[PDB]
Symmetry: D2
Subunit: 387 residues, 4 copies
């Protein structure tokens, strides 16, 4: 039961199942995986595709001949399995040169290098068929207040993204960018810390249509925010170009638990929203099998990501299709929420005594919302305990 299919579009970063287990306090617990191995094993589990940072696929500093051979082997694995590459990204965070940032490093020479490193990988992403190019600016930020003038850093961040937009336009590429917010870690505070901040920033770019967000479940939860609500705002803005699925237990370091772990009810409401809205992008997992696990546990954890999505999809669909739930939604006036407040227009509203002088505030206030019964129907559906 709960078998992944190609139409599910489940994807995984090479760096997810390939995470060797090094953490702030501990050495690696697993050997490095050849990307070819990961492609073949993920395909066997029913995944649709993989994603990569440049330096996951091509060791940093590789010669041109080494780069060609790494890509050739990877493409053979994709061809052997039918796996796709819908998204790629740049590693602008691991190498010491990026310790104060890539696009917003105080040193101008580093900013220029970061752009050139990204541009090289955009070309490769396009060659591999990627539709989306993610940017997670994990080193953009500060540990102290004097170190980073945020207005100047935002100017540099806009300049960088504008140059990348000019680049893809000039090459006729169809790829689009997706900015991944995170509030902190590894910097004390990261620039563009939430979906909202990233959405706002995009509106000030020269070609805003080329940019959207890549929100990650656990990152919004590191600020204690409601991830489904943030996804709703991104969908409302037309900017949900990609998504990173995982689990997180609240306000901690970025745990990258398998999807469904962490906040299970938020996972339910997320799946309900994505499916109801008809989100058509990859269901991408940015997760880490815990370092306690051997490779059998790696593949079990990856399989669990997909399984949990599919269970939640079933339960959310059953919730929405249940005539008792539909009745409860009407009892709670969800239908009214979807109607305009004043399609009659401002003057009619100003002239409407039923909206002021003749509005019975105490009668209105007496009406219960019936939200608790609705939420218990949702719980019963999630748990398969209807009756």
């Amino acid at each position: 039961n709960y078998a992944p299919t190609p139409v599910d579009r489940f994807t995984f970063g090479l760096w997810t199942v390939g995470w060797q287990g090094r953490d702030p306090f501990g050495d690696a617990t697993r050997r490095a995986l050849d990307p070819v191995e990961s492609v073949r094993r993920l395909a066997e589990l029913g995944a649709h595709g993989v994603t990569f940072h440049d330096d996951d696929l091509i060791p940093f500093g590789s010669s041109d001949s080494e780069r060609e051979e790494h890509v050739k082997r990877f493409r053979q694995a994709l061809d052997d399995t039918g796996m796709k590459v819908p998204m790629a990204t740049t590693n602008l965070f691991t190498h010491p040169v990026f310790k104060d940032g890539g696009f917003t490093a105080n040193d101008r020479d580093v900013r220029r290098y970061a752009l050139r490193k990204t541009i090289r990988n955009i070309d490769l992403a396009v060659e591999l068929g990627a539709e989306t190019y993610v940017a997670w600016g994990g080193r953009e930020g500060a540990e102290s207040g004097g170190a980073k003038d945020v207005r100047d850093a935002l100017d540099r961040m806009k300049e960088a993204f504008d140059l990348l937009g000019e680049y893809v336009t000039s090459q006729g590429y169809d790829i689009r960018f997706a900015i991944e917010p995170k509030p902190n870690q590894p910097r004390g505070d990261i620039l563009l810390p939430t979906v909202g901040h990233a959405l706002a920033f995009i509106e000030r770019l020269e070609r805003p249509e080329l940019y959207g967000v890549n929100p990650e479940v656990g990152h919004e939860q590191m600020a204690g925010l409601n991830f489904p609500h943030g996804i709703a705002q991104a969908l409302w803005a037309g900017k949900l170009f990609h998504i990173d699925l995982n689990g997180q237990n609240g306000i901690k370091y970025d745990q990258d638990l398998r999807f469904g772990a962490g906040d299970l009810r938020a996972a339910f409401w997320l799946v309900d929203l994505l499916e109801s809205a008809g989100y058509s992008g990859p269901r991408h997992f940015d997760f880490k099998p815990p370092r306690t696990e051997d490779f059998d546990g790696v593949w079990a954890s990856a399989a669990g990501c997909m399984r949990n999505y599919l269970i939640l999809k079933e339960r959310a669909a059953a919730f929405r299709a249940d005539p008792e739930v539909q009745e409860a939604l009407r009892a709670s006036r969800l239908d009214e929420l979807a109607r305009p407040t004043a399609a009659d227009g401002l003057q009619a509203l100003l002239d409407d005594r039923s909206a002021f002088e003749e509005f019975d505030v105490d009668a209105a206030a007496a009406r219960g919302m019936a939200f608790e019964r609705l939420d218990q129907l949702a719980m019963d559906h999630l748990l398969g305990a209807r009756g």
Copy 2:
């Protein structure tokens, strides 16, 4: 020392010093204050002005004659003291009718009433000379996932703000709106939970120039965010129309401590930013003297808000003016951060071997940022411990 002056533009809500001390677990500890008393006492402390919700100035449900008398007495107090009213707002949160929201209540009749209540108070705000009209949507949100379709709620929130913009335009008013984010409390999650989300929303309004943000120190800190960074993004966007100053100890219920309490170093960096950027708006305190205090403690707490701002202003100015700090800022390349990455343009960057093939990444990575010495100069300046 540290005496407030009119040019400081310190303002206070009537509901701040007037808070009677009722909390989720406790009854009021102080009697209600007449707004006239608060105006006169705040003026004696050196405040510039006050702000109000409709229902702070005019008891809810007042007749027209009662409304006139309350406003007349208030205006006499303002005239007697020289106090100004730069901002006003609507209470769309206390009355039970607003239990599921004002502008985004599921019930359409409530949404219409909320708009009419706001419009009536915009007229009064203009009559009192207010330049800014704040909206804190404290009841907009949910405790459960099925209760609120966030895309529909954002449609209703946009409709409401668009109608208000049409209203002020039609009346020829110069007032502008400032949306106040908060992540949670009193709703389990509040819509537009951070500065970023509010900035993004504004960009989708029909007349975006009429709307900005009113960020509150403690509200961003309830999501664990860096308040100075968020203010920098608002300034970068041209949207810092007003600000609420207070203190908060991290991720808790909204404490509304006096300004300078809570995160003292964030208060320092905030003042540094506001002064450096030339922010010209009110320095408004949205705070609550703790319920442990009698009225002498109320006025001490209000005086402390202003005193702490002025101490921090002095220390931040001394930091920025110190030639040793200026040298440290250059050592940390803050000057380079402010220079364009690639004013030479995209093609020149692509052709520049110094940005890629000839970039010595290991030499760059070896350069220290010297951020710790800079931050210790900042600490020494804050504490008055230079030497």
Copy 3:
């Protein structure tokens, strides 16, 4: 399905279903309930009993004749329904006199009054058959560092609890005390902020056997802690005298959501632990139907507390009884965790080359824990998705 029974021992505070909906920003949305009404309605839902603060049952300041009549009516309702009263507590937080504390108020006269108020209610609790007397010191703490010397406050807190222990011993009562930790709210920081701090404090009382903890799900989660882990430590110490069940979404104000809401997987692991350990005390709900609800929603929310406990009990029992789970627990070495490390004794351990010189650390490190497969079996059992 999932029908409560008397052996379930589900109990509710009068103040839970009786919460009128006043919050930091909003007036009451529901009328006050007569305790008699609550007893009868809860009995109809299958509850076992209720609990009370003194001032929930007897209005503060009541005369002796008024007190007798309130108790008489309540006892008739208990007799009419078969409902029990297993626990009672004192309100040492609502009245303004307690603004700086009860037992740890700086004012000595207030500390003495708090003790006398508690002692009067202990007598009533015993008359009603209560086995446990809870103390939640919600006003014990501070908003500022100079206001409360914590060593002195702990001396006063110990003195108070020691006097109460002397009192019950002198009267021959069998009741025992349960201290309820909370980290903050309504004070900026509350003394004894977690289960651990309360357990440690108890060990320093004169008669430690008379005192245990009353942990509350949401309170430990307000510090981001693992509630099942804290309950395990309380059980390990022999100190889980009572428990408060509810839901919470992380690090926020105390939400008091119905049990099962908030962190659903933590609710699952809690029920698993309580049932596995054979906890025999009340399953008490300290929750608040949201103020959006009318009385039908109040009773739906209360019913949901019990329903969710019973669903989780079923799923946890099925998890533990599943031979595949039992095999997975052995694969993960949970059996070894339960065996002594060195029952052979210290000298044998020191002499055992297999523990040092001949321990193959790399072979040990290569063994996977298989925790992810175990956790996915747990997820499948919780969701009723085995297959």
Copy 4:
């Protein structure tokens, strides 16, 4: 000004200034330091001593001859500088063998090895003159609920600490143990997550007098707790055997900022408490110079730890010595808090009409606490802004 002296007893872990800068997302930015270098540089800054994990001083897996040479070189550096070694600890977290724990690993063979590794290093600590042996169980815990039975793990943790106590007793050593709590990171939840939980656990050991706590500023703040309050409880219990000083910005990953950074006012109240209580132990810094820094920044950051302690010591002493503050403390009844509630005894309290029938609750409730004026005097003293 603010020059460290030997009587200040400032100490640093080898792993602090020696941190190479590897984080969850980034490679090392600094070369490894020879411990001899660190001893000499710290001595030049005015430090009193260093501390070490076994594997900081002796590379893991060293032969006996290699171990002797590493210790000999280290001791020469200590002799050359006058530096002391007051504390040592075991690394039971870096090596992959410890991925599920040391003392509470599910695998019994790992638990036995962890004990033998610790015992070997206790012998070395004693040879170097250490008075305290710290244990930070960073791998004790879980990412999932089924992986770790916490009651069984606490049994194993008690068994381990009891064996270590038997060991030191049998060898006649004067060293004592200090358990270092942390709530999470690197495990999803860590056992003994706070000062309170560790204090409670110690009370159940066979020889409780041999064990205390080593609280760390940032670790308690990762649960949003008040670090000065927790230190007060440890002092009240007689269990503050050692302390780790650093800075933290709230509920995040463990930042290990220099002391004084992070929550500056909590640092002030901590120093006030340690000095007022006469804490006589090391002022030990467990911090990490940010990876942005070169070695000059490492030493600047270490110097800043000591400087900030000394500034705060001066300001706290001036606060306590100021006759205006002493008057404010009396106005706030801090003197009464330190007096017994009922030295007259229980029967006298029960017979005292002034404690109940004749207690004027409304007159008591009207008295203000004057805490805001007291706290503003504290702020003025911290900032050197008295006047």
